[PDB]
């Protein structure tokens, strides 16, 4: 689109609004984007606000060099040398200093992370003190990008507060105001001549990472030389709001809440919505592997590490991550396996240890089996083990607490998964090319896995198992076309069903005998 243009696309599913698809299209051997999709396909517009980025070889000539004081060289002898905003990767929060050495007008300073004002000039917080009586009105704040101007050895000493030097001569403008802010070391520049920058009382990098004696400074590969660049696509925020308005008094109104699922990178501080990992591969794969480690650490019954991770992944997040039909393929299975390995894989193994012991009391309700009403099992008075769940609060009675598991409500989840299964089979039965995780493995595999582990754990009673058998039997998920690792799960779904009759029949024999 251009300057004052209005566009209107339609990605299928508008066959009634498909105006000329009859006279050209259908009989001419073509198709819309309606042939499979029950979602809305997301749109990726380009951004207006710029955001800083790493430096690949995608310039005519830009080359930062990790050298060993311990500097970072450059080069910009090209056709376009207009504006190149530079910053280091990680910032400092709230004693050490920082060097630059320019040959040819060209600035240095500190960027607070809220900065996207690409401008070829000098411009931009300024709030006064309030002591409830007026009467002070002086200052609390200055900062927002700092400005300074052979070898120019300008050095930004910080903390504490903010100062400056210029080849030994400290200039003015000591912005001594930042309460607990984060400070990017940064450089605004034009480049005239090449080899323009070099970077780096004790010395610097100790005040930055986690080892903090570290008086000899030492570069690491995590340091970068980020450049403010213009455009990267954004997701469309597929369902927005149902705001409503008025005119006599202007009642603007909204009542239907919608919630994000964001994650903020801590060392390059910004919050990304989790859906935009769909195309960003490294930030996908590392978070997937972290979701694996959150399960592998809390494995085989560590009932205190589970109480640690319930404060860290925080259950109403998981109920979003089950439900949202847009999340990527790996990250769906990661959150399902994390749910099972936090709340459900402690008790489920404790019931698959006692699946072949079959002991039963001989009292009056045990004799009361009719044995054969002439899987959704009626009375079932065997002596299966006992589940206890603990609330994961934060008080100092934790030694009695951290002994069983964390708890999160089963009554919601066991209707959520039946709703999800019906929505799954009855939609995906007609062979969409959509399905949620991209391929039908991530659609079904970590849904039937939760369904299996919830089936074992002693819920889905008669009133719901009657609803459950309709999805498989009708007498259908068992009858469809399925790949290999989903019917692998269905075999273990069938085996417990066959194994329920044996537990019925043993209690039948005892009720007779």
């Amino acid at each position: 689109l251009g300057v004052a243009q209005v566009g209107r696309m339609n990605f299928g599913k508008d066959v009634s609004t498909l105006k000329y698809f009859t006279i050209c299209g259908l009989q001419e051997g073509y198709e819309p984007f309606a042939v499979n999709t029950n979602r809305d396909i997301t749109m990726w517009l380009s951004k207006r606000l710029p955001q800083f980025l790493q430096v690949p070889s995608s310039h005519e000539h830009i080359e930062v060099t990790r050298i060993d004081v311990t500097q970072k060289s450059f080069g910009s002898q090209n056709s376009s040398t207009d504006i190149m905003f530079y910053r280091l990767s990680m910032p400092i929060e709230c004693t050490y200093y920082y060097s630059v050495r320019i040959f040819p007008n060209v600035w240095v300073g500190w960027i607070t992370s809220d900065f996207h004002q690409y401008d070829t000039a000098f411009d931009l917080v300024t709030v006064t003190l309030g002591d409830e009586k007026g009467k002070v009105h002086e200052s609390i704040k200055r900062s927002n990008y700092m400005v300074c101007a052979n070898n120019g050895l300008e050095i930004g000493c910080v903390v504490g507060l903010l100062t400056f030097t210029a080849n030994g001569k400290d200039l003015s403008t000591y912005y001594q105001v930042e309460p607990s802010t984060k400070l990017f070391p940064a450089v605004f520049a034009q480049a005239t001549s090449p080899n323009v920058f070099q970077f780096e009382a004790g010395l610097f990098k100790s005040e930055h990472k986690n080892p903090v004696p570290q008086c000899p400074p030492r570069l690491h590969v995590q340091f970068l030389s980020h450049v403010l660049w213009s455009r990267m696509p954004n997701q469309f925020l597929k369902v927005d709001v149902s705001r409503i308005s008025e005119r006599q008094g202007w009642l603007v109104q909204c009542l239907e809440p919608l919630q994000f699922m964001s994650l903020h990178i801590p060392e390059e501080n910004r919050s990304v919505d989790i859906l935009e990992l769909t195309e960003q591969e490294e930030l996908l794969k590392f978070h997937y592997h972290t979701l694996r480690l959150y399960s592998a650490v809390c494995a085989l019954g560590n009932h205190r590490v589970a109480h640690a991770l319930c404060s860290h992944v925080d259950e109403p997040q998981l109920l979003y991550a089950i439900e949202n039909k847009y999340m990527p393929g790996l990250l769906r299975a990661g959150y399902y396996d994390l749910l099972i390995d936090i709340h459900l894989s402690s008790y489920a193994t404790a019931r698959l240890m006692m699946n072949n012991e079959f002991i039963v009391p001989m009292t009056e309700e045990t004799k009361s089996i009719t044995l054969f009403p002439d899987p959704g099992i009626g009375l079932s008075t065997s002596l299966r083990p006992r589940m206890q769940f603990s609330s994961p609060s934060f008080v100092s009675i934790n030694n009695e607490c951290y002994q069983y598991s964390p708890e999160f409500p089963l009554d919601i989840l066991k209707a959520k998964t039946i709703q999800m299964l019906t929505e799954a089979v009855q939609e995906g039965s007609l062979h969409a090319r959509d399905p949620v995780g991209g391929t039908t493995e991530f659609l079904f595999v970590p849904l039937i896995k939760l369904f299996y582990t919830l089936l074992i754990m002693g819920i889905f009673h008669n009133e719901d198992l009657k609803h459950i058998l309709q999805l498989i039997e009708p007498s259908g998920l068992l009858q469809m076309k399925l790949p290999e690792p989903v019917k692998l799960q269905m075999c273990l779904l069938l085996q417990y069903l066959c194994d329920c009759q044996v537990r019925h029949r043993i209690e039948a024999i005892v009720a007779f005998s």
Binding site: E357, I359, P361, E484, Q495
Partner: protein, 201 residues
């Protein structure tokens, strides 16, 4: 069909359909019935049994010693030793000790097994069958369970053979410096007398 876990999980499920009575065969020597007045304690047995079994896969030993202490002092552990013979819980503790023997765990382990033989006759017969490995682990107790497996019953006193005894006097030949002979011979006295009359063979 590739992914041969799928083939195996298919055919086991297929064979269980056409052999129902075989499935009922391999489930009847595990069942058991108990009177109602003993419902409440065996759950506290069963829930204290799984803490043993879930501790099978790991200073990690203080849980096991308290678990065996809660099992040994239980009301229904004398009362129906067919149950504890059928739940495999002689083999559970045996496997735990075998996992240890690649210090105070073995000592409070084998005392449970020496408690396990002296409650029934058939239970001692069930305990007997690991003796061939069980003799190879003289630490200093792990030999006491080899003793109290053959302590009293004459049929088990007759059943064991000469290679089981030959490695005992091999260990005695190893005592050719001693002090470890006062226990080894304490095994062999149970091997030849066992009631009051010396078994000829």
């Amino acid at each position: 069909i590739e992914d041969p876990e799928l083939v195996r999980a298919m055919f086991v499920l297929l064979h269980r359909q056409y052999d129902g009575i075989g499935g009922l065969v391999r489930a009847l020597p595990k069942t058991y019935t108990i009177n109602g007045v003993s419902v409440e304690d065996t759950i506290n047995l069963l829930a204290s049994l799984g803490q043993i079994r879930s501790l099978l896969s790991v200073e990690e030993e203080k849980l096991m010693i308290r678990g065996l202490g809660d099992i040994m002092n239980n009301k229904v552990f004398y009362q129906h030793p067919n149950l504890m013979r059928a739940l495999g819980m002689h083999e559970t503790v045996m496997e735990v000790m075998v996992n240890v023997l690649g210090p105070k765990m073995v000592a409070n382990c084998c005392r449970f097994l020496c408690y396990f033989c002296r409650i029934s006759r058939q239970n001692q017969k069930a305990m007997f069958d690991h003796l061939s490995y069980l003799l190879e682990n003289s630490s200093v107790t792990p030999l006491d369970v080899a003793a109290a497996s053959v302590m009293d019953n004459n049929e088990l006193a007759l059943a064991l053979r000469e290679p089981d005894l030959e490695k005992v006097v091999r260990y005695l030949a190893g005592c050719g410096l001693p002090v470890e002979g006062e226990r080894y011979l304490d095994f062999l006295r149970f091997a030849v007398f066992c009631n009051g009359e010396s078994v000829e063979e």
